[PDB]
Design a binder for this molecule. Structure first.
Ligand code: CA
Ligand code: CA
Lengths: 201, 201
């Protein structure tokens, strides 16, 4: 079965930094395809290097949780994904001075309200800037609460990256380099492959 | 008549910096629509803020003249634009150490070979980094040579921007801010509106 996956997020999903606006999608598409899966990335945005065959996504540079929440019902209905890769909330902290634990929790609930049968992955951030660790701390507990209730939501610990600022951060000093995005892609793979293979089988 | 316009370029067209990957397209779409024109931006990329109704383009962050040349025949045939807004070559200088006057000249010729009836606008750059001025210098003469021969190619002097590094450059120190992109949009408008109104009428 072809699996429709909607990458939803901020500039880390749209792909600012290195990698020609492919984010982790370039390498992850490779890994999932090599694993024998048929993947359709879905979303209305389109960006990436020439090498990425499927450049569709819902990554929006600059966006916060409530901005995603304001539009995601439409995106879900338009694209009807089987799986959502959600990576969001850094801008709530860094742009809005909000640790938005409640917003994230509510957004997860909202996604399942609109698409009850979807499988949802929720990521934390690589540890840069240092301040983001404060937000990373709250995410595993939020996800675990929903999972314990029977929701198909799973945590992707991107913060387990073997982080090296001299290789993994782009020329802009904030966003990931191509190498950093490859490391991130490998962590998505680690945390998603077994569930994806089950959905495909 | 609806005018199909294909924005072709590098990160300055894709929209790195400020403005949520809308580049000059956000403000220029407004200005052209306010002027009474029906504009369809065309291209396979899609990015921009929620406010931009038409987010299609062929801006590719990181790309050089030969990379554009390698693919533009396909883009032209796929999208069949009436007008091309070409803004390219900064990366040839800054990434490849090539002042690519010959590449630009050949790319202009190539565009008309594939689409003889197209109208082409060719831009120089805002003067940042300082080094880009060396490339800006060569562009007007290349365009004028082709125009004198009867080609529908026109120079857009983006370098006439009233440049203020404290307002016009984004947090990354290289790409334009939202304000900078608005200034650029106004210069595109200045140099294109009369020709566009004629094409529409
Ligand atoms: Ca797709
Ligand atoms: Ca369009």
């Amino acid at each position: 079965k072809t699996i429709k996956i909607m990458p939803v997020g901020d500039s880390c999903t749209e792909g600012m930094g290195g990698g020609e606006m492919g984010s982790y999608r370039t390498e992850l598409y490779r890994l999932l395809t090599q694993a024998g899966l048929s993947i359709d990335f879905v979303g209305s945005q389109r960006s990436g290097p020439s090498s990425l065959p499927d450049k569709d996504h819902e990554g929006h540079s600059g966006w916060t949780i409530p901005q995603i929440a304001s539009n995601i019902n439409n995106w879900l209905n338009t694209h009807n994904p089987d799986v959502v890769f959600l990576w969001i909330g850094g801008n709530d902290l860094l742009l809005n001075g909000n640790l938005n634990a409640t917003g994230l929790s509510n957004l997860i609930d909202q996604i399942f309200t609109v698409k009850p049968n979807v499988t949802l992955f929720v990521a934390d951030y690589y540890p840069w800037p240092e301040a983001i660790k404060q937000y990373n701390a709250v995410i595993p507990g939020i996800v675990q609460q929903k999972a314990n209730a029977g929701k198909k939501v799973y945590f992707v610990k991107l913060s387990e990256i073997q982080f090296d600022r001299n290789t993994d951060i782009s020329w802009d000093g904030l966003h990931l380099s191509e190498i950093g995005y490859k490391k991130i892609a490998n962590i998505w793979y680690k945390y998603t492959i077994d569930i994806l293979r089950a959905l495909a089988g």
